[PDB]
Design a protein around this ligand. Structure first.
Ligand SMILES: *[C@@H](CC(=O)OCC)[C@H](C[C@@H]1CCNC1=O)NC(=O)[C@@H](CC(=O)[C@@H](NC(=O)c1cc(C)on1)C(C)C)Cc1ccc(F)cc1
Length: 181
């Protein structure tokens, strides 16, 4: 098996988890220690269902930029037994585009699912169901409901978290390493 498949399957084993909130099914990315990230609209509460058990949430942070604009990412500290494998080194230091990225999804409904979104380009502002959002990127792929939280990856780099689409295109919140320092 080659390196790209190996890397994505290793994410799925160690960092990319099937979850459920009151809003439904999402992919969760565990980044390090007991810190994970989810799309803001998943609206995690005091507890979250992770794979096979209810986990308590000790803290949630909704990220906004200096202008007070939604970034569509919530950082959760979990009451988990184990630390996540630390993947902050794979998250670029600034929001980065990519070529021929793969969207990796892991939900009870869409388990271990690989979506060939293709090139990922700068997009910036995005009106997400009436919510103004910054620091997004775009792929010309018809992504669908249930894919939010999906991890946008390319060549060993973890660069986005899927957050929406319009039936022709998909958008992610961009990831940068400072979010998890
Ligand atoms: C993932 C969450 C989900 O499944 O919720 C159940 C509806 C989902 C992925 C997209 C659905 C269709 N295609 C997808 O890939 N995300 C959402 O539903 C968010 C909202 C959207 O994606 C909306 N799209 C846009 O607003 C938009 C704008 C442009 C230029 O292109 N698309 C559509 C449903 C209209 C959920 C969300 C996020 C943030 C919010 F504040 C509210 C809702």
């Amino acid at each position: 098996m080659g390196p790209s498949l190996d890397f994505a399957l290793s994410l799925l084993r160690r960092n990319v988890r099937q979850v459920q909130t009151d809003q439904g099914h999402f992919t969760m990315l565990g980044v390090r220690d007991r810190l994970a990230v989810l799309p803001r609209h998943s609206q995690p509460g005091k507890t979250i269902w992770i794979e096979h058990k209810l986990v308590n949430i000790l803290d949630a942070v909704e990220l906004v930029d200096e202008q007070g604009v939604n970034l569509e990412l919530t950082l959760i500290t979990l009451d988990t037994n184990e630390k996540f494998r630390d993947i902050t080194k794979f998250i670029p230091e600034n929001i980065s585009t990519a070529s021929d990225a793969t969207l990796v999804i892991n939900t009870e409904h869409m388990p271990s699912m690989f979506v060939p979104v293709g090139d990922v380009v700068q997009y910036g502002f995005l009106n997400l169901s009436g919510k103004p959002t910054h620091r997004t990127m775009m792929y010309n792929f018809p992504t669908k409901a249930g894919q939010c939280g999906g991890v946008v990856t390319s060549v060993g780099k973890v660069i986005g978290i899927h957050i929406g689409g319009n039936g022709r295109q998909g958008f992610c919140a961009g990831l940068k390493r400072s979010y998890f320092a």
